[PDB]
Write a protein that binds this ligand. Structure first.
Ligand SMILES: CC(=O)N[C@@H]1[C@@H](O)[C@H](O)[C@@H](COP(=O)(O)O)O[C@@H]1O
Ligand SMILES: CC(=O)N[C@@H]1[C@@H](O)[C@H](O)[C@@H](COP(=O)(O)O)O[C@@H]1O
Ligand SMILES: N[C@@H](CO)[C@@H](O)[C@H](O)[C@H](O)COP(=O)(O)O
Ligand SMILES: N[C@@H](CO)[C@@H](O)[C@H](O)[C@H](O)COP(=O)(O)O
Lengths: 319, 331
């Protein structure tokens, strides 16, 4: 494919390699601040792909750092005019552009309530840098495609590095170091999502569990954004509590399979909706040696290239 | 009338809630003093399905009315990854009609083991959640026999509101709770809003709301999946523009959840935008009755529950027992 989306997606391994080297000192310093600060919770501020990145941070910081983590509801402030008690907590503002006024207004509120504030932004110069305490630059470069690809993976890579520095888990440190090579391997692997599966498919469900669910939300957003498919992401545990009735009528399901602690639970539910008659399409990791916490990113890196081709086959310009 | 268990159970909700608010006055008054002494750093909500969606209502409620960060637990953190969180000094509310899902129970045990003050809002008095937590607030909705929750969700919201009124002691919230049965009854008596003809030939749609209206939108979208087999997805009307709005390029049905609260201005402006872009709009509203803005979401929903029961019949689904569902689901 010759779209901006695919071209930008293919630069993600090398954009991240430069990011991990360039940010090593920044995130090394931040991890010690967090080890001293000992945040009571982490609140994520962002929209769209950045908000989905925050769902990844929830699983990351709760599993790896034991810190309760969640997403802000911007309307609480911008519509209802309320402040939250955020003293003793960490606020992470995620924004590729980093200049939208809604985003800046919530950063000011978070700082005014006593939170330690960090921003993950692609433009380090934007005025958000004057509000927050620490800026971690995404270093993804300009994103010209409508669909975020590299800027999302660079958000995850920054979150993983902050997590590796903060917790100091050496296993997680090696996974972050292996990220560029793992992503490059994903780019070179064979396609998984093929357009023939998605012909005449107006809506579908993306099923995942754990980190795989967090990446499902981003896959679901991309299916909407570049394929005009009404795709909705569910945890495979949550799907059984009502939504599974849609499998009684024809339903396509995109299965996000991650080889981590969640695998056992997740495959049990994939078998169930399969017996119930759903048309499964299986996404999985791209190489055998990939660390479980990094496997979600490689799956997405592969999906980004494959979904660009699916968009073209459906007559949509993903850009 | 649909003669379904779902509709019948939904119609008992004003009386069930009136009885609940009066029976729980003592326990909820005590909990409010506990919360004023405990001073929670945050509220974490544990639940699935309609109970998880009720927790989204609690987020807007406790954040707007008490300034306490509020959010949903990811049970897999505990039940699959086996981690305990640092929860000392935080409040954990387990919401469950049945009180038996194992991911829910494992997450309650880990919250209790982590030093959090734990509260359960549960309908089934016999459920094992009562043996893990510190305080139980009985929902007092009676047995719910339809698979689709109606009264038990409204009773969850009514308990969350009473807890808020007792904890904050805001006279607005106290008046809102005092007025709730009458608002629910008025909604039961109001004219139907959602009609089956609006949803025939709709395989998927978007529910749009903002604030508390977004919170009830998630429950509406689940009901449309659960009893109408429609792929309904709920979005905030702020969030919808960041990508999902692309679905308006083809024909797209949109269910508009309109709440006459602080969110009204932003929301109606965005409804007008997706209308101009070519979306097929369907409007739900709080009923004409003079409703407190914080009770308006519940009243809209009380109306929707009865009306959706008729949509289910018209689409050939038995809302009481949809083809692939149990009342007590275990994950
Ligand atoms: C749960 C989560 O990951 N994020 C949600 C997001 O999906 C939603 O769109 C937003 C609405 O914001 P609003 O209340 O400002 O409209 O609230 C939350 O942060
Ligand atoms: C309001 C909100 O964002 N709630 C989500 C819920 O939608 C999701 O289904 C669940 C998955 O739990 P799991 O990690 O056990 O699958 O986690 C979160 O609490
Ligand atoms: N372009 C979409 C993602 O592909 C959109 O959802 C995007 O993530 C969001 O609207 C912008 O967020 P930002 O502040 O990170 O740019
Ligand atoms: N029956 C459904 C709601 O109509 C289902 O999603 C339900 O809410 C879910 O299984 C959780 O049930 P609980 O409240 O008994 O925990």
């Amino acid at each position: 494919t010759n779209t901006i989306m695919e071209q930008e997606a293919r630069t993600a391994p090398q954009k991240i390699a430069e990011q991990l080297l360039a940010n090593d000192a920044i995130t090394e310093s931040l991890g010690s601040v967090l080890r001293e600060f000992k945040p009571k919770f982490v609140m994520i501020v962002g929209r769209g792909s950045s908000d989905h990145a925050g769902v990844f941070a929830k699983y990351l910081f709760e599993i790896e750092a034991s810190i309760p983590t969640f997403a802000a509801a911007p309307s609480v402030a911008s519509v209802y005019g309320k402040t939250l008690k955020l003293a003793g907590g960490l606020v992470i503002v995620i924004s590729q552009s980093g200049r939208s006024p809604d985003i800046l207004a919530q950063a000011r509120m978070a700082k005014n309530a006593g939170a330690f504030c960090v921003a993950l932004v692609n433009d380090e110069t934007a005025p958000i840098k004057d509000i927050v305490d620490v800026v971690i630059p995404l270093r993804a470069g300009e994103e010209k495609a409508v669909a975020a690809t590299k800027s999302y993976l660079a958000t995850l890579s920054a979150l993983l590095q902050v997590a590796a520095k903060w917790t100091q888990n050496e296993s997680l440190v090696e996974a972050v170091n292996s990220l560029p090579q793992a992503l490059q391997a994903a780019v070179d692997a064979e396609p998984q999502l093929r357009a023939g599966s998605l012909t005449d498919v107006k809506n579908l469900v993306v099923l995942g569990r754990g980190f795989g669910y967090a990446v499902s939300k981003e896959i679901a957003l991309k299916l909407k954004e570049v394929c005009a498919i009404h795709a909705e992401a569910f945890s495979s545990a949550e799907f059984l509590h009502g939504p599974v009735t849609l499998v009684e009528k024809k339903l396509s399901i995109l299965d996000v399979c991650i080889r981590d602690e969640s695998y056992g639970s997740h495959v049990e539910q994939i078998a169930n909706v399969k017996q119930r008659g759903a048309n499964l399409i299986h996404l999985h990791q791209t190489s055998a040696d990939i660390h479980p916490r990094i496997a979600p990113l490689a799956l997405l890196q592969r999906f980004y290239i494959d979904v660009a081709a699916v968009a073209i086959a459906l007559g949509i310009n993903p850009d």
